[PDB]
């Protein structure tokens, strides 16, 4: 800002070194420049944004995780929120939009706190002491997953994640698909602990029909093409055996770097015939075992295709390594890298073959996929998305991916908190009376931390093209009276949030908006570490490349 500083007077540096308040001023502008994007994308009233690669392709991404990933930011402090948005996907998987706005606001309001001459250690302590009481307050206001007789939770859990997305209007239809997909892919480990392998549900891209007609596949759907067209396209009957092999079925050279030297010319043909015969020995054991479908990681040579057509076996080549591991557990088959055992003999055992109800290959809009349904050993699920184009399905692919991570946190930990600015507004009133007790120089730091969390509920009303004050002023009326609501349920005054469609304050429990409690704990801790690292930088030194 203003005029550039002089370059290394008596300092004798080859790069640029700026000191004073100019560093902290540019550090705030770094977080404010990347925030103005994420800001307008927050809430159900948020709008998608389009990023262009200048090569002719566009990318529509609502959340700030991929937006900050695609946008190149060369500012040293600007890369913190870029890595923070990429981080939020790793732990929780959702909240990349809220973690960037909060972390940018913690630094924004702290820019006026350093003008007071307050040292950052007082500012950092004021944010940490207020955070320790904030995490404890969230655990006190949480609600149990019991609620009424029926579940009435997991359906509402997905509807919160479906907000801010184009499919948000269809969230009523996609609510039952996400819940039924995660419950089928559940596993068990740690002697009774249930785990949820996110990404195990296949997301397929199809064109035509509509997103409301997308059918949930009761099983795994493999994306690939049939080896030979002479194979039967549909396989019926119960107990369908599936073979998953990681070994090359194509003819390969002998050993690796050896050399074949032949003296007697009569053996020139017999040696070459054996190289092609060894490959078909592994196929003969598969045909005699009764395997209907043969899944191979690598390609399949024409020598192995003639044996599958005559035996009415469906061959599949060029399979992903991560895709076949999920097929083995679901169908019950054991992954076979090679045919061998402890004994010196080589044979194929029928126990390595899986079982399912039906194997059929479906073709819709140039997309060919084999539908494996009715797995007896372990159930699975797959979702086939239908939309305008591939880029229209790119946002729908990440929309359902974020919904799988939100439901996972509610099943592991049944503690949930209401959305719509309930947590951010409740922490303000709790920290107002707490700051008056400490006093001294930490009272202003805690007061600004409670006001910094107000950016989330205020962003909802700004993006809705409505009056923000009347919504926030009435919002505080319930939360300010909630701390003074006093014991005796008749308490109420809590779990209230903004309704952006109707412009009223209603109960979020009856509205069907809930958010995992762990999502609030990991977001406030990750957003603070981004602000603490920036407030501690006195001088930025940029060395020119050689």
């Amino acid at each position: 800002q203003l005029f550039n500083n002089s370059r290394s007077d008596t300092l004798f540096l080859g790069g640029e070194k700026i000191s004073g308040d100019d560093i902290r001023n540019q550090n705030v502008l770094a977080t404010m420049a990347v925030a103005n994007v994420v800001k307008s994308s927050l809430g159900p009233v948020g709008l998608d944004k389009m990023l262009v690669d200048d090569i002719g392709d566009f990318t529509v991404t609502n959340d700030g995780a991929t937006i900050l990933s695609l946008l190149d930011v060369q500012h040293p402090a600007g890369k913190i929120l870029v890595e923070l948005a990429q981080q939020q996907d790793r732990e929780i998987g959702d909240g990349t939009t809220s973690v960037v706005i909060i972390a940018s606001e913690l630094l924004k309001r702290a820019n006026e706190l350093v003008k007071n001459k307050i040292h950052p250690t007082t500012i950092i302590t004021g944010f940490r002491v207020a955070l320790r009481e904030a995490i404890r307050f969230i655990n006190e206001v949480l609600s149990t997953s019991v609620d009424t007789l029926g579940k009435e939770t997991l359906i509402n859990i997905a509807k919160t994640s479906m907000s801010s997305k184009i499919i948000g209007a269809d969230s009523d239809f996609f609510s039952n698909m996400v819940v039924d997909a995660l419950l089928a892919v559940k596993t068990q480990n740690s002697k009774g602990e249930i785990k949820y392998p996110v990404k195990a549900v296949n997301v397929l891209k199809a064109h035509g029909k509509s997103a409301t007609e997308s059918l949930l596949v009761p099983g795994y759907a493999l994306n690939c093409t049939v080896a030979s067209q002479a194979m039967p396209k549909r396989i019926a009957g119960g107990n369908v055996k599936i073979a998953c092999l990681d070994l090359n079925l194509q003819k390969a050279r002998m050993a690796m770097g050896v050399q074949i030297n032949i003296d007697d010319p009569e053996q020139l043909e017999q040696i070459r015939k054996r190289e092609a015969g060894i490959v078909l020995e592994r196929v003969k054991k598969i045909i005699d075992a009764g395997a209907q479908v043969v899944l191979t990681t690598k390609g399949i040579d024409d020598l192995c295709l003639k044996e599958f057509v005559e035996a009415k076996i469906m061959g599949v080549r060029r399979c992903k390594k991560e895709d076949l591991r999920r097929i083995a557990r679901a169908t019950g088959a054991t992954l076979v890298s090679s045919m061998s055992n402890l004994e010196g003999e080589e044979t194929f055992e029928s126990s390595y073959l899986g079982l399912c109800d039906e194997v059929v290959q479906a073709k819709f809009s140039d997309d060919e996929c084999i539908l494996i349904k009715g797995t007896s050993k372990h159930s699975s699920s797959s979702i086939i998305l239908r939309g305008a184009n591939d880029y229209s399905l790119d946002e729908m692919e990440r929309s359902l991916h974020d919904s799988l991570s939100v439901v996972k946190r509610t099943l592991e930990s049944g503690n949930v908190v209401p959305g719509g600015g309930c947590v951010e507004a409740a922490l303000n009133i709790y920290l107002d009376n707490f700051a008056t007790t400490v006093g001294s120089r930490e009272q202003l730091a805690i007061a600004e931390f409670a006001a910094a969390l107000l950016i989330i509920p205020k962003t909802l009303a700004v993006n809705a093209a409505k009056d923000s004050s009347e919504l926030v002023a009435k919002l505080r009326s319930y939360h300010a009276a909630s701390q003074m609501a006093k014991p005796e349920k008749r308490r109420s005054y809590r779990n209230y949030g903004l309704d952006l469609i109707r412009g009223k304050i209603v109960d979020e429990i009856h509205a069907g908006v809930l958010e995992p409690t762990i999502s609030k704990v990991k977001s406030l801790k990750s957003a603070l570490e981004a602000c603490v690292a920036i407030l501690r930088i006195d001088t930025m030194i940029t060395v020119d490349p050689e």
Binding site: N36, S468, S469
Partner: protein, 520 residues
């Protein structure tokens, strides 16, 4: 249809900027805050100064909000509003130009989080226009009639933040008698004029009852004229005394050689005729705007009559008021009663420059000071402090009012505004309480330049307004906070009145503009 190109018509000419979107009005706020960043450390007597060098390599050191903005050329449309309020505050009152820009920029900074919300642009201006109405009426309660006690205190506080402030035990004594020589309803701004002499020490300056001007020209008969007069008579003349064509045209037609000699002798007699009429009236000093050749100067040397020329029109206007004389554009109308006089006339050399000293007149409205200093800016900063200090005691003669300074004004006005926001609205209460905190930037930033803790000061200001009443303010010497009435620090009310009206008008102007178009 005339070509396969078929260009697309653009509404605006190429080179025009864009607007609307989000952040266009925010761009105007950050432009004013960045300008405010330079003027904040210059606030307060312990504040610093800013060194500015223009494209002409002209060194100027100023902490004044008006002078700093005149040096830099501001091409930003919204940032030029701070320049207008700085020049408007300096024109009338002359003081507070730095405080107006700091206050006007803070009103935009406190309105920045309101624009990001759903608050309309006109709703914010409703808070500032209503609060300034009750703020002006609050200043009238701060001020006192002070018809009792009969310039000394207000002139010392005006020199703060600027040079010679520590010398106020000296220069202030000259500022008191400077404006007192000016009668009511006149109060001429030229008669207080001050001349700058490069070189010397500023403590060697002295007070003069009349104008002193530079000769700017060396006459061949100058030294033959006495430089010390016991009872001089000053005569102001617009005539031009020398040998030259008379009026606007020169031509001569002479047929005979005998008549050719009379033409030359006639030119000498006409020029000498104007010289004899001056001697018959006994005028010891002759001043003229038009040049005067060595012919008229040497004639005045034998008669012991002082002669001068080249004097600017602004300096001779001070001569008529100093000696009570009159301007005579012809030598035939000179009468004895139109000549002024004084007690004595002595020519003293100051910094290799000789000046004419007019002093000792019974009644003189002219005040001219001779300033010295090492740097060329030192002599400029002193007059810059004296010119601003005279306008403070100038406005005090029309109305005598005292308002406690040192942040005591903004804290008392903001107290009654928080009570007004408590009684009514609640939609506007967020804006009014923001205006009360926006007035606190003046006492907060003024205490940051002294290195004192702002938290300890501001916390002790708010709770102390019960027993402190209106006069409770900050004390620099004892590092404590105590009544400024006992500290004698005073200040007129006209400084704070124009400061609140200029900051509100400049803030509401930009908040009402959401679009800025720049052609070419």
């Amino acid at each position: 249809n005339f070509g396969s190109q078929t260009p697309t018509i653009v509404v605006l000419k190429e080179g025009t900027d864009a607007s609307q979107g989000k952040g266009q009005i925010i761009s105007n706020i950050n432009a004013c805050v960045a300008v405010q960043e330079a003027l904040k450390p210059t606030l307060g007597p312990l504040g610093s100064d800013i060194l500015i060098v223009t494209s002409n390599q002209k060194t100027t050191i100023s902490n004044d909000g008006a002078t700093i903005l005149k040096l830099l050329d501001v091409v930003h449309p919204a940032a030029k509003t701070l320049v207008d309020i700085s020049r408007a505050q300096d024109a009338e009152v002359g003081d507070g130009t730095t405080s107006v820009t700091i206050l006007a920029g803070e009103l935009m900074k406190e309105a920045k989080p309101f624009l990001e919300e759903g608050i309309s642009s006109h709703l914010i201006m409703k808070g500032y226009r209503k609060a300034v109405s009750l703020a002006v009426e609050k200043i009238n309660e701060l001020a006192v009639d002070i018809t009792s006690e009969k310039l000394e205190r207000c002139a010392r506080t005006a020199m703060s933040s600027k040079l010679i402030h520590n010398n106020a035990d000296f220069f202030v004594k000259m500022c008191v008698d400077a404006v007192l020589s000016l009668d009511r309803n006149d109060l001429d701004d030229k008669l207080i004029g001050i001349k700058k002499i490069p070189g010397g020490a500023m403590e060697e300056s002295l007070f003069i009852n009349g104008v002193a001007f530079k000769k700017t020209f060396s006459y061949a008969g100058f030294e033959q004229q006495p430089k010390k007069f016991n009872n001089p008579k000053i005569l102001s003349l617009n005539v031009e005394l020398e040998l030259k064509a008379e009026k606007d045209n020169a031509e001569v037609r002479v047929e005979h050689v005998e008549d050719y000699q009379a033409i030359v002798d006639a030119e000498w007699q006409l020029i000498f005729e104007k010289l004899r009429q001056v001697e018959e009236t006994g005028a010891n000093i002759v001043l003229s705007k038009l040049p005067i050749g060595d012919l008229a100067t040497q004639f005045f040397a034998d008669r012991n009559i002082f002669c001068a020329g080249r004097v600017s029109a602004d300096d001779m206007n001070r001569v008529i008021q100093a000696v009570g004389g009159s301007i005579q554009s012809t030598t035939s109308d000179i009468k004895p009663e139109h000549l002024g006089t004084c007690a004595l006339f002595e020519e003293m050399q100051i910094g290799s420059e000789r000046y004419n000293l007019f002093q000792g007149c019974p009644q003189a409205k002219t005040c001219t000071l001779l300033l010295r200093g090492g740097a060329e800016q030192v002599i400029a900063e002193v007059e810059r402090s004296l010119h601003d200090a005279i306008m403070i005691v100038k406005r005090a003669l029309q109305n005598k009012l005292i308002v406690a300074g040192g942040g005591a004004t903004e804290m008392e006005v903001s107290k009654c505004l928080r009570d007004y926001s408590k009684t009514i609205a609640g939609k506007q209460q967020m804006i009014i309480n923001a205006f009360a905190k926006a007035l606190e930037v003046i006492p907060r930033q003024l205490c940051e330049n002294a290195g004192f803790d702002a938290i300890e000061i501001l916390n002790k200001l708010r709770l102390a307004h019960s027993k402190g009443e209106k006069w409770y303010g900050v004390v620099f010497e004892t590092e404590n906070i105590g009544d400024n009435f006992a500290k004698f620090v005073w200040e007129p009310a006209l400084v704070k009145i124009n400061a609140l009206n200029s900051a509100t008008e400049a803030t509401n102007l930009i908040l009402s503009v959401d679009e800025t178009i720049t052609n070419k």
